[PDB]
Amino acid sequence: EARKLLGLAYPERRRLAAAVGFLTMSSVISMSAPFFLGKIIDVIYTNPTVYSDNLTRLCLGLSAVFLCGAAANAIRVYLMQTSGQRIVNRLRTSLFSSILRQEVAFFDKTRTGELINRLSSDTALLGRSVTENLSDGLRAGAQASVGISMMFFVSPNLATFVLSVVPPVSIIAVIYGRYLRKLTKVTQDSLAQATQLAEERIGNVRTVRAFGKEMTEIEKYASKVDHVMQLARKEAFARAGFFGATGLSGNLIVLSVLYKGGLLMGSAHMTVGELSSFLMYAFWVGISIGGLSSFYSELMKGLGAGGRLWELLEREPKLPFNEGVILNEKSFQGALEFKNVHFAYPARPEVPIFQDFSLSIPSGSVTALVGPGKSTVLSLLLRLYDPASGTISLDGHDIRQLNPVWLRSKIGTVSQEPILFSCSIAENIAYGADDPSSVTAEEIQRVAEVANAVAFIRNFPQGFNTVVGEKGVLLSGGQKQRIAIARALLKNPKILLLDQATSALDAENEYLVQEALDRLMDGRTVLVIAHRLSTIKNANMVAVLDQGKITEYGKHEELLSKPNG
């Protein structure tokens, strides 16, 4: 905890030291200002002598001290703010890397709102409570120490009087401040309860009107708001008492401090300037107390934010993200098998997902699953989740030992409703390739021509640089699926995993989709998951899944003449 907070400021060792030096300089040459003002006043009022040549020099000299204080304050502010920024940036980048490196299963139990809030709000608190708050704390502490210590040096007898009435009175103020707060909380609770009755009923005007009971709601609300009104009166009385007592006490305390200082004769006589210095120091101490209180509150909030931020950066990923082996050397075309895998979602272990599999995929096949949960094979083949009780083999060797990046690069998937990123079409297509920057302009046009997407990609109102997304230029479903079809062609997937929408679409544009969605059967091992009979009659195997198991694993001819039907 506290040991790790020192680590954050370790990159900034030289910047922060200068800030503390300039802070202490400013405090020193700012708490010796009341002392000189007393001398200046005594030059002209306690005994005027015969005060025009011994006054210009003093003011002219003190102006220089004021200038130095201003410069020191400026430099301190600049250094502290820059250090805060340069710590917050590092925290933000490291937190984003740690979050993005984690496994998929973590995002199921954690909402995006919490992660975004940690990414923006809490980092500001953790970067401000280690540099831009300790300066204020140190300044407040120095102010209080120098103020109280030097207040005894001017008049000890009057300093023991100001520490016998101010302390006990301020104790009552803290006690009296909680009564008003609890009364206000009570009134606010009653108002919230009354409002919760007026939001439900407006939400159900249809049912409150069928029976004809509408006025009765008006009297119920009237009674509730009257009850809220009566409790609010008891708050006003206490507030009036507080205001009167606080004004009277302050005025009488100042008058009593002033009055006593004129009756001290002989032993400790107070010239005009010394009284002014005394009063200034009292004010300074009064400010410093509130400074300390604010510092403590801010420090506690900062520790609260740090408690949550100090966790994601130190969490081990559940499954390996790198450090694998790539066999390559060709001799690999979609030859994968299953060994009766059993697993449910890690998010929900209640209902089973896959209880049995005996499915095999050969080279140059258009094998097609069918049934009624069958879409989760997509998740398994790309190594996002992990089998619980089973084994997936790819050309003898299993997919566990392989490096996930190369495996996910070779396997390419196409769906019906694809997520579209907020960028130009000239980039989204390049997103498939290994290097999105190293793409020629004509390659995008050629790929659009292959997928027949030039009808809209070239002819935008903003051209190729159109921002595509849910906002602004809304692309149609057919076009936004044709762009996805064109996306995967650049990475040359040896295994293609299509998908079928249950809801039908317009047949006017169906020719282009039928020329890209299932016309990509260019010798690639394809596991089409569809329901149309055309794919069933235009493929090798039509294996059927039902009740979490594989029943039929024959070609189309064998399954064509079912024993029952």
PDB file of all heavy atoms in Angstrom, residues 312-325, unseen atoms left out:
ATOM      1  N   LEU A 312      -5.918  -4.185 -10.852  1.00  0.00           N
ATOM      2  CA  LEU A 312      -5.884  -4.681 -12.226  1.00  0.00           C
ATOM      3  C   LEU A 312      -4.458  -4.813 -12.742  1.00  0.00           C
ATOM      4  O   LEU A 312      -4.147  -5.750 -13.488  1.00  0.00           O
ATOM      5  CB  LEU A 312      -6.697  -3.761 -13.134  1.00  0.00           C
ATOM      6  CG  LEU A 312      -8.210  -3.812 -12.944  1.00  0.00           C
ATOM      7  CD1 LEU A 312      -8.863  -2.590 -13.555  1.00  0.00           C
ATOM      8  CD2 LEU A 312      -8.769  -5.081 -13.554  1.00  0.00           C
ATOM      9  N   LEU A 313      -3.576  -3.887 -12.364  1.00  0.00           N
ATOM     10  CA  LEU A 313      -2.192  -3.946 -12.815  1.00  0.00           C
ATOM     11  C   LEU A 313      -1.454  -5.169 -12.289  1.00  0.00           C
ATOM     12  O   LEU A 313      -0.399  -5.516 -12.830  1.00  0.00           O
ATOM     13  CB  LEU A 313      -1.443  -2.682 -12.393  1.00  0.00           C
ATOM     14  CG  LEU A 313      -1.961  -1.348 -12.923  1.00  0.00           C
ATOM     15  CD1 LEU A 313      -1.349  -0.203 -12.148  1.00  0.00           C
ATOM     16  CD2 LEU A 313      -1.635  -1.225 -14.397  1.00  0.00           C
ATOM     17  N   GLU A 314      -1.974  -5.826 -11.256  1.00  0.00           N
ATOM     18  CA  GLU A 314      -1.307  -6.956 -10.620  1.00  0.00           C
ATOM     19  C   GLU A 314      -2.192  -8.196 -10.617  1.00  0.00           C
ATOM     20  O   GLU A 314      -2.310  -8.894  -9.608  1.00  0.00           O
ATOM     21  CB  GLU A 314      -0.879  -6.600  -9.198  1.00  0.00           C
ATOM     22  N   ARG A 315      -2.827  -8.489 -11.749  1.00  0.00           N
ATOM     23  CA  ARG A 315      -3.656  -9.677 -11.896  1.00  0.00           C
ATOM     24  C   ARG A 315      -3.110 -10.532 -13.031  1.00  0.00           C
ATOM     25  O   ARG A 315      -2.905 -10.034 -14.143  1.00  0.00           O
ATOM     26  CB  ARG A 315      -5.116  -9.305 -12.164  1.00  0.00           C
ATOM     27  CG  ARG A 315      -6.115 -10.268 -11.546  1.00  0.00           C
ATOM     28  CD  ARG A 315      -7.545  -9.874 -11.864  1.00  0.00           C
ATOM     29  NE  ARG A 315      -8.023 -10.510 -13.085  1.00  0.00           N
ATOM     30  CZ  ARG A 315      -8.469 -11.757 -13.156  1.00  0.00           C
ATOM     31  NH1 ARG A 315      -8.513 -12.537 -12.088  1.00  0.00           N
ATOM     32  NH2 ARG A 315      -8.882 -12.233 -14.326  1.00  0.00           N
ATOM     33  N   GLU A 316      -2.876 -11.809 -12.747  1.00  0.00           N
ATOM     34  CA  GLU A 316      -2.329 -12.708 -13.750  1.00  0.00           C
ATOM     35  C   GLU A 316      -3.413 -13.120 -14.745  1.00  0.00           C
ATOM     36  O   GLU A 316      -4.542 -13.422 -14.344  1.00  0.00           O
ATOM     37  CB  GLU A 316      -1.734 -13.948 -13.088  1.00  0.00           C
ATOM     38  N   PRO A 317      -3.107 -13.136 -16.042  1.00  0.00           N
ATOM     39  CA  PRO A 317      -4.085 -13.622 -17.023  1.00  0.00           C
ATOM     40  C   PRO A 317      -4.391 -15.098 -16.813  1.00  0.00           C
ATOM     41  O   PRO A 317      -3.525 -15.882 -16.418  1.00  0.00           O
ATOM     42  CB  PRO A 317      -3.396 -13.377 -18.369  1.00  0.00           C
ATOM     43  CG  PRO A 317      -1.942 -13.291 -18.048  1.00  0.00           C
ATOM     44  CD  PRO A 317      -1.851 -12.701 -16.676  1.00  0.00           C
ATOM     45  N   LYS A 318      -5.644 -15.471 -17.078  1.00  0.00           N
ATOM     46  CA  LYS A 318      -6.085 -16.836 -16.796  1.00  0.00           C
ATOM     47  C   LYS A 318      -5.467 -17.841 -17.761  1.00  0.00           C
ATOM     48  O   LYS A 318      -5.068 -18.937 -17.352  1.00  0.00           O
ATOM     49  CB  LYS A 318      -7.608 -16.914 -16.840  1.00  0.00           C
ATOM     50  CG  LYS A 318      -8.283 -16.427 -15.571  1.00  0.00           C
ATOM     51  CD  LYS A 318      -9.775 -16.723 -15.591  1.00  0.00           C
ATOM     52  CE  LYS A 318     -10.374 -16.636 -14.195  1.00  0.00           C
ATOM     53  NZ  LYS A 318      -9.598 -15.722 -13.313  1.00  0.00           N
ATOM     54  N   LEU A 319      -5.378 -17.493 -19.037  1.00  0.00           N
ATOM     55  CA  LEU A 319      -4.854 -18.377 -20.065  1.00  0.00           C
ATOM     56  C   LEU A 319      -3.714 -17.691 -20.799  1.00  0.00           C
ATOM     57  O   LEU A 319      -3.678 -16.460 -20.895  1.00  0.00           O
ATOM     58  CB  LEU A 319      -5.955 -18.794 -21.055  1.00  0.00           C
ATOM     59  CG  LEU A 319      -6.730 -17.748 -21.864  1.00  0.00           C
ATOM     60  CD1 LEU A 319      -6.040 -17.399 -23.175  1.00  0.00           C
ATOM     61  CD2 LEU A 319      -8.146 -18.233 -22.123  1.00  0.00           C
ATOM     62  N   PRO A 320      -2.754 -18.460 -21.315  1.00  0.00           N
ATOM     63  CA  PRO A 320      -1.586 -17.851 -21.967  1.00  0.00           C
ATOM     64  C   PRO A 320      -1.985 -17.034 -23.186  1.00  0.00           C
ATOM     65  O   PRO A 320      -2.864 -17.426 -23.958  1.00  0.00           O
ATOM     66  CB  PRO A 320      -0.724 -19.058 -22.356  1.00  0.00           C
ATOM     67  CG  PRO A 320      -1.191 -20.168 -21.473  1.00  0.00           C
ATOM     68  CD  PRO A 320      -2.651 -19.928 -21.262  1.00  0.00           C
ATOM     69  N   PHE A 321      -1.324 -15.889 -23.354  1.00  0.00           N
ATOM     70  CA  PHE A 321      -1.547 -15.021 -24.499  1.00  0.00           C
ATOM     71  C   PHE A 321      -0.446 -15.127 -25.547  1.00  0.00           C
ATOM     72  O   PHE A 321      -0.668 -14.736 -26.698  1.00  0.00           O
ATOM     73  CB  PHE A 321      -1.672 -13.565 -24.036  1.00  0.00           C
ATOM     74  CG  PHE A 321      -2.126 -12.618 -25.108  1.00  0.00           C
ATOM     75  CD1 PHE A 321      -3.343 -12.798 -25.742  1.00  0.00           C
ATOM     76  CD2 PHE A 321      -1.340 -11.536 -25.472  1.00  0.00           C
ATOM     77  CE1 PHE A 321      -3.764 -11.923 -26.728  1.00  0.00           C
ATOM     78  CE2 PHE A 321      -1.755 -10.657 -26.456  1.00  0.00           C
ATOM     79  CZ  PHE A 321      -2.969 -10.850 -27.084  1.00  0.00           C
ATOM     80  N   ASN A 322       0.721 -15.649 -25.178  1.00  0.00           N
ATOM     81  CA  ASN A 322       1.847 -15.779 -26.094  1.00  0.00           C
ATOM     82  C   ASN A 322       2.682 -16.982 -25.667  1.00  0.00           C
ATOM     83  O   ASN A 322       2.211 -17.856 -24.933  1.00  0.00           O
ATOM     84  CB  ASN A 322       2.663 -14.482 -26.134  1.00  0.00           C
ATOM     85  CG  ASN A 322       2.204 -13.544 -27.228  1.00  0.00           C
ATOM     86  OD1 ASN A 322       2.337 -13.842 -28.415  1.00  0.00           O
ATOM     87  ND2 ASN A 322       1.657 -12.399 -26.834  1.00  0.00           N
ATOM     88  N   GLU A 323       3.928 -17.025 -26.146  1.00  0.00           N
ATOM     89  CA  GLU A 323       4.865 -18.108 -25.857  1.00  0.00           C
ATOM     90  C   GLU A 323       4.341 -19.455 -26.340  1.00  0.00           C
ATOM     91  O   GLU A 323       4.079 -20.354 -25.534  1.00  0.00           O
ATOM     92  CB  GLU A 323       5.178 -18.166 -24.358  1.00  0.00           C
ATOM     93  N   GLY A 324       4.180 -19.599 -27.655  1.00  0.00           N
ATOM     94  CA  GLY A 324       3.761 -20.850 -28.250  1.00  0.00           C
ATOM     95  C   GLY A 324       4.707 -21.252 -29.362  1.00  0.00           C
ATOM     96  O   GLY A 324       5.787 -20.678 -29.527  1.00  0.00           O
ATOM     97  N   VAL A 325       4.289 -22.254 -30.135  1.00  0.00           N
ATOM     98  CA  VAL A 325       5.085 -22.795 -31.230  1.00  0.00           C
ATOM     99  C   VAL A 325       4.240 -22.814 -32.495  1.00  0.00           C
ATOM    100  O   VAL A 325       3.033 -23.077 -32.445  1.00  0.00           O
ATOM    101  CB  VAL A 325       5.613 -24.209 -30.907  1.00  0.00           C
ATOM    102  CG1 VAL A 325       6.684 -24.141 -29.828  1.00  0.00           C
ATOM    103  CG2 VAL A 325       4.475 -25.119 -30.474  1.00  0.00           C
TER     104      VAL A 325
END
